[PDB]
């Protein structure tokens, strides 16, 4: 463990679980996801769940939230996962973003970033130079 | 979705400029 990263899992899960017990389950997971436009069923959700969940407990613990969080760091230039972030990076759904629905993201998911915060972001992920991140940026950006 | 979102919104985040 990295004492940069001494407890950033507790960070994030400290904005996510609400009920106290510190495991986020479907409807907790829901809202969260509910708060970024998008609106699924129980087994969309459920899905999610099984997609993290390896023990067959069916939600997400401790074990997982550091097995995972390998994974994903090792996994992220894979396919799909290149447009599952894009796509919570997303809100309008038109293929790009900039000062829009990205400060949305952030405050519903657990980041701080101001302005001149993302302003970085943006000259961070804005290889083609129009002041934007797109499809055809991320994937760069998402590996390199 | 929202635990590997977040792992991923990190790895987005933390390259030479921004944390
Ligand atoms: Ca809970
Ligand atoms: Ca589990
Ligand atoms: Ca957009
Ligand atoms: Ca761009």
Known sequence: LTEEQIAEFKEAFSLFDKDGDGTITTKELGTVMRSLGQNPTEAELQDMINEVDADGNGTIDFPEFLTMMARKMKDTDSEEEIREAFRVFDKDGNGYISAAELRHVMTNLGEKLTDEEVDEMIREADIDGDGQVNYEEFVQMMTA | ?19
């Open chain 2, 1 to 19: 979705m929202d635990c590997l979102c977040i792992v991923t919104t990190k790895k987005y985040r933390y390259q030479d400029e921004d944390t």
